[PDB]
Symmetry: C2
């Protein structure tokens, strides 16, 4: 009863089933003026008819093989749910009719003897919005429902759907796999689209939850349906166009993506790569050749294929007349041959060849969901077998006493179906968990266009092994992947382009972490990585390059010790020492000959002892350059004609006491200065407050000035061949040198702050011997 | 029939109803050894019994007032769904029993005359996981279901739930309101918790979708249930403890938050503020006084209260004996008085006072959902009224012919219920939209503890006007809000603390945009805002401050025009001019008196014409400082005793030709230099390649040196009171000055690169007159 398009066959134990022979109900909506009537289904699903044949075929195989359920035949009352909850509930209200005694004792059948004989276990409700609505009605009467296709995670809640097992993997793994793919191809800017029913809605939240532990920032997220209006479809395609993201993760069903794909083709939005859910990655509505402008390269998923023997030869044995136990055969015949079967449209002779036309009923390469239908009805058969072959004192019920077969109930088959452990025709073990589902391995496919009259071929490009360890589960042989149909290079679908090794990452306000700008950082930056979020600072003896990469450029070494700028002045000091020694020899052979020669040679020999990079001793040894000058300027008071002479320690010991007092105040330490930035590693010796200045003013500007007022009366007096005149000329040379010293010493730094003093001491002590020794010798 | 705890009363038109008298079914799960039986409900819901009394009371009011539905009495078959889909489906399978002809013609009642008289419109299914499961079964038979409490957005899909209207607002507005509150209090780091059924799951996705257009980054998102296990509850409280976010948006129901709230109290996780959904913000399971350590200050929502007259006096008229049409009264009596009614537990006399004990059945301050029950049954009455008072040729059905009352069907009441426009007892208009719901205004409450024996009082702190414009809908009078129970200051719940105006925002890799670090930016930074994501760069005449805020510090103005460093040298130049003029007057009164006085005064008067900030003319007027020196040094060849003399243009015109050729090569333009960074706005005049150097070497070092070999034979020759000797002394002064000029000119910059040349010209031209004019005058 119920609907009047059944597929019915009597038997001892009646199964029942629910299959999607059409794709939907008609678009007519009632205004409720007239009394409402049953809505008529519109499209046709040859894949759904193949699923129905796979159920019926395995029931004939169980009734054929006598090693499984002997002297007991299986019937079935297979209905058709046109992918709608109402058409499914009209069927599963006729499934539970004899069981409807427990609340309504007022059934009292009164229209049949066996009273619509009680279904033991229903196999069906493909959609997950349909299984959720049928498993609520098959949960009061405890009839087990073994669904072959519904694969949402809401149905794995065994406090509400108390009797629901399924032979298709959960979708907690597929939303992990679609994040592993996006992580593996190094994308971080994707968008999601999900069908608004119980399949896409809790299956895109798992992808959102598992693509933010990988940094898979989501761009947009829209929900579609198969009954959405034109404003909603236009809004979804405007969000697709208004964005810049090439990976679109579509977690939807077959005919829910149809109004979006039609309109995206009609508006020609090319470039995106569609990661596909399992429900539409092998679909005879989206894989159509004229959609291949926008739908190509769609890396999808598919379940593990099966092998059913004799099934393809059983599919061709169909007929609208020889099949008396199949009410859908006439509708399939008329829809596949464009006939009109008589018992615009020509009358059908009924002698056609089924292998002649091209249709998804017989043009298939792998059984994937049809094998799940076969496996579900074999699961119910292998539970009825264990009820059949149970010995007393051994079973599963209370006190081990198992139940009979001739009066078997639905909850006993549910109890045995929970504890199921059997083997297929492929040697695999099938067992339902505590949440009642199987576990399987996905085989990632790709959408290629066959270049000889073929529609679309699905080329397998890897797997997804769910048994392996977390992290190593995905294998993508990416030399078979044709990006957007024809290309070969992996497309760029990041948000902002990853900047180079000279720049850092700077963010925009109101945009995610996955989108930045990239600016350069200054002054000791050294962005050593490629995408560093903050470039560091260099060590103090290093400075950044021109391209702002790793700072291998060190700072200065400004010393000029043996350089060709200081070595020539050292040669001048050696020439002064040699010219002094050649006069000392002529003064020895041929106190003003001992001290005013020895300290005079010291003032020109220790003046070469202030070059190079200074240190503690080379920074404390600047005091002899004045202490020896104060003793070598004693000739101006010792060689005069106004001459008890060995009391030069009335000034030399004063200078020595000044030096011994000032060596603690002006410290014996070079001080490295930071005046420039790039190459500024200095050494400047940092005289304290007044020490060397007071020492110079009290010796080298005081003795030569106290000699000045004493020799100004003798400058116009020649004596001993004008010795006073030559002393005054050397004193004028010394005054010119000490006038030239101080401003050039004040207005220089570093390399040129010592080369003024060391040149001025040379220029004074060379004149103070060349004006005097030559005139005293050559006369 | 169905369940054997009904509330039944016969009548002409039977309504039906579904109410949550208990809170859930017992925790016993079947192992299916025994034959499974009906599970027994556990807790009690006095609020649910108040809702049942509000339905029954309005049915008595319709049967009482003769102005509404006269000569026609309303019955009801009210059942009890213990918040479970299975207990609701056992009831709504006994609602549709006479309507079960359309698919099963084999009903053929055979146990009643009227055959369980057909319910016209059911009122119930409070939960939104229960209304979704009952509206699928009341959508084949087109019975209208007017739910009073289910408020999810999945039920507003009129292609699947074809007959479902409701008198509670949708939850597309409440998830907007909870984002408006978080935006209004300036939070950006929240966490969400949602009950895993059809209420929290599509209601937290709307909050996630509307709290990322406001930048409301989400921290965590967990799903709970009332059947969750201890590992899941421990995981949720470990995510709450392991996070740092104080705003927790709980979108859940009453008894779904119970195992989380119990365990959070048992582990004492204090500090969080719980934004509440409407379902538990006024709940007699969470608002309990011992939970107030962690549950306080919970800014919730509540619907608009109603006024039902006579209802509180009707509630006290209940009795287990006088109520013959109410099967729940004995259970309510026994559960509220701890009795055991006879027809551990003492026997009940049945003479107690209902207003004596404290219970949520009678301790209420505002009718919110009870008014919705009243409004739903008045909606069905005001649709039956319009079927009653329809004139022919005027109705809503086909060709205007409306239907009778004595044979009325469910789809006619559905048609009239769609077109409903009536008025309450409060003067408000009630009309269902095209998606079949009402619109209402929320009244935001807060959870205060009453400090005299009270449990928890709910103090209203504002509203949420959904009729107003988008953006201005929320009004929070925040001087009534007690944060976490007692406090008064708004709590800080951002991710990272907003940094100051000296620093920028730097990001962390692997963390959202809402969390940053804050580093300082250098060298012309001027972070003018408070939380700028990138600090700008200053204009070139400005440099950054010490605190790196807005750069008001301008650069240098190094000129020294009228400063106390250049004005004293200008006074020295004026003194040189005056001392030259006083000698010119004594040479006039008492060509070497004309040219060697006029050009000599020019060389000391135009030497003050090179001070200040230079410009085109003040940078081209450096050439007279050599052109006048070459003409004023002509005295050294014009005043000698070896003296056709007016051919000084054999050198002065050569210098003039050099200047006229070099004024284009060395350009007349000051060049601003950038040698330092902070205060470095310079002017340096940028001599070209060799122009001034060659001019100086060809005039001022050439004439004085060609005079040298001519006057070296006359230096030992006194003539005209030693004029040659005084000329040689002035030439030695000039040679000393031009030896002191060049190194101090080379080793300075800017302010000290002109003050060396302008001092050296003064020192040369003062000596070249003071050595000569004084000896020529005073003799
Ligand atoms: C889109 O943005 C992505 C950021 O999420 C980029 O992903 C980055 O790719 C890098 C390779 O180009 C990865 O570097 C790897 O780092 C690990 C250590 O973390 C090393 O062992 C690997 O050797 C190294 N890879 C190579 C080739 O050297 C980054 O780790 C990775 N970022 C993250 C967060 O994982 C994408 O590159 C970018 N897209 C494009 C096209 O550039
Ligand atoms: C948590 O982070 C939030 C960032 O999302 C901070 O929110 C910022 O608060 C500022 C006020 O303190 C807002 O400034 C306002 O800016 C508008 C113009 O955009 C002006 O008209 C207002 O006058 C100005 N407010 C004041 C008081 O001057 C920021 O706009 C706002 N950020 C955003 C993105 O809106 C929170 O402040 C922060 N929490 C705490 C406690 O600081
Ligand atoms: C799951 O997928 C994997 C890979 O696609 C399959 O694992 C292989 O199984 C064969 C047969 O046992 C082994 O010889 C290989 O070594 C396996 N590959 C590995 C471990 O990488 C497996 O057949 C699939 N199906 C199931 C049910 O596990
Ligand atoms: C919705 O909420 C608002 C504010 O809580 C209420 O609006 C006020 O209504 C009264 C009566 O009409 C007016 O006098 C006020 O001016 C309104 N306030 C405004 C416009 O800010 C309103 O009563 C609530 N209910 C409905 C059904 O709108
Ligand atoms: N899991 C799918 C059902 C499904 C799997 N494969 C399919 C192929 C076609 C149609 C539906 C399916 C759903 O929830 O809807
Ligand atoms: N909308 C709630 C129903 C509800 C509203 N208020 C309530 C108060 C108590 C219990 C349930 C409710 C839900 O979907 O579940
Ligand atoms: C798309 O972008 C245009 C231009 O900014 C804008 O006008 C339009 O509203 C956008 N549409 C959507 C859906 O964002
Ligand atoms: C869509 O665009 C592609 C490439 O731009 C082009 O080949 C194709 O013909 C277009 N189709 C339509 C219908 O505009
Ligand atoms: C043993 O089995 C009988 C019926 O088979 C049952 O009534 C009884 O309770 C059982 N006893 C135990 C201890 O299991
Ligand atoms: C039962 O199933 C388990 C795995 O689920 C398997 O290891 C075991 O071999 C099965 N039992 C038998 C008897 O095959
Ligand atoms: C909480 O933090 C601790 C310490 O880092 C960690 O060991 C634990 O696994 C965390 N738990 C969760 C649920 O994040
Ligand atoms: C929980 O903590 C609060 C404050 O720390 C304290 O007042 C209260 O007594 C605690 N309760 C328990 C059970 O530890
Ligand atoms: C008028 O009404 C009759 C019955 O009331 C109906 O059969 C007929 O179709 C209607 N005609 C029009 C034009 O509405
Ligand atoms: C019908 O409802 C509208 C608003 O929905 C209201 O404006 C109008 O007044 C109502 N009709 C009557 C007759 O009150
Ligand atoms: Ca398909
Ligand atoms: Ca934003
Ligand atoms: Ca409650
Ligand atoms: Ca991260």
């Amino acid at each position: 009863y119920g609907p009047d398009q059944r597929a019915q066959k009597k038997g001892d134990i009646i199964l029942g089933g629910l299959f999607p022979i059409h794709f939907g109900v008609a678009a007519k909506d009632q205004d409720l003026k007239s009394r409402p009537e049953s809505v008529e289904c519109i499209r046709y699903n040859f894949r759904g008819f193949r699923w129905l044949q796979a159920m019926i075929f395995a029931i004939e195989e169980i009734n054929s093989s006598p090693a499984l359920l002997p002297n007991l035949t299986l019937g079935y009352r297979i209905f058709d749910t046109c992918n709608t909850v109402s058409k499914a509930l009209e069927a599963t209200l006729s499934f539970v009719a004899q069981n409807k005694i427990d609340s309504l004792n007022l059934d009292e059948f009164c229209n049949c003897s066996e009273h619509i004989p009680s279904t033991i276990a229903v196999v069906g409700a493909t959609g997950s919005g349909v299984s959720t609505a049928v498993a609520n009605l098959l949960g009061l009467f405890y009839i087990p429902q073994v669904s072959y296709a519904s694969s949402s995670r809401l149905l794995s809640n065994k406090n509400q759907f108390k009797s629901f097992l399924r032979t298709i993997p959960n979708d907690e793994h597929q939303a992990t796999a679609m994040a592993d793919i996006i992580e593996y191809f190094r994308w971080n800017w994707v968008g999601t689209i999900a069908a608004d029913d119980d399949y896409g809605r809790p299956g895109i939240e798992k992808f959102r939850e598992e693509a933010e532990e990988r940094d898979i920032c989501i761009d947009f997220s829209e929900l579609i349906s198969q009954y959405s209006d034109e404003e909603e479809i236009q809004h979804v395609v405007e969000v697709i166009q208004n964005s810049t993201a090439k990976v679109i993760v579509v977690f939807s069903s077959g005919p829910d993506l149809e109004p979006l794909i039609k309109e995206i083709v009609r508006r020609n939005i090319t470039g995106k790569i569609w990661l596909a859910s399992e429900a539409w990655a092998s679909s005879s509505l989206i894989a159509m050749p004229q959609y291949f402008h926008v739908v190509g390269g769609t890396i999808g998923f598919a379940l593990k294929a099966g092998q059913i023997p004799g099934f393809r030869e059983f599919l061709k044995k169909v007929h609208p007349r020889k099949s008396v136990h199949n009410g859908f055969a006439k509708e399939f015949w008329e829809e596949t041959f464009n006939c009109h079967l008589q018992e615009f449209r020509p009358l059908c002779t009924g002698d056609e060849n089924i292998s002649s036309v091209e249709t998804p009923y017989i043009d298939y390469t792998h059984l994937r969901i049809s094998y799940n239908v076969y496996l579900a009805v074999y699961s119910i058969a292998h539970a009825l077998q264990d009820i059949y072959t149970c010995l007393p004192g051994r079973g599963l019920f209370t006190n081990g006493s198992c139940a009979d077969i001739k009066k078997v109930e639905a909850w006993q088959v549910l109890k045995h179906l929970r504890h199921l452990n059997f083997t297929n025709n492929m040697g695999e073990q099938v067992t339902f968990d505590e949440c009642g589902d199987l576990v399987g391995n996905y085989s990632i496919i790709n959408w290629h266009l066959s270049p000889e009259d073929g529609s679309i071929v699905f080329k397998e490009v890897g797997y997804y092994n769910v048994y392996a360890k977390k992290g190593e589960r995905l294998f993508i042989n990416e030399e078979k992947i044709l990006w957007s149909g024809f290309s070969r290079e992996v497309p760029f679908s990041n948000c902002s382009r990853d900047c180079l090794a000279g720049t850092r990452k700077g963010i925009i306000e109101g945009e995610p972490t996955c989108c930045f700008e990239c600016v350069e950082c200054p002054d000791g930056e050294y962005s050593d990585e490629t995408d560093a979020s903050a470039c560091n600072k260099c060590p103090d003896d290093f400075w950044s390059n021109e391209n702002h990469t790793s700072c291998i450029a060190k700072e200065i070494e400004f010393l000029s010790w043996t350089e060709p700028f200081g070595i020539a002045l050292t040669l001048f000091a050696v020439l002064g020492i040699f010219l002094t020694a050649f006069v000392l020899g002529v003064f020895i052979k041929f106190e003003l000959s001992y001290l005013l020669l020895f300290s005079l040679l010291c003032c020109f020999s220790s003046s070469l002892f202030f070059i190079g990079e200074p240190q503690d001793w080379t920074c404390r040894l600047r005091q002899p350059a004045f202490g020896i000058s104060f003793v070598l300027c004693i000739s101006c008071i010792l060689v005069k004609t106004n001459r008890q002479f060995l009391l030069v320690f009335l000034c030399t010991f004063m200078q020595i006491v000044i030096c011994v007092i000032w060596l603690y105040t002006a410290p014996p330490s070079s001080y490295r200065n930071q005046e420039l930035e790039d190459e500024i590693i200095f050494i400047t010796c940092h005289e304290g407050s007044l020490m060397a200045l007071g020492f110079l003013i009290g010796y080298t500007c005081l003795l030569a000035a106290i000699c000045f007022f004493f020799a100004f009366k003798s400058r116009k007096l020649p004596e001993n061949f004008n010795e006073a005149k030559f002393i005054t000329f050397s004193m004028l040379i010394f005054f010119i040198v000490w006038i030239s010293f101080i401003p050039a010493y004040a207005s220089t730094y570093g390399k040129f702050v010592s080369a003024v003093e060391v040149i001025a001491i040379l220029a004074a002590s060379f004149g103070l011997l060349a004006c005097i020794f030559f005139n005293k010798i050559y006369i």
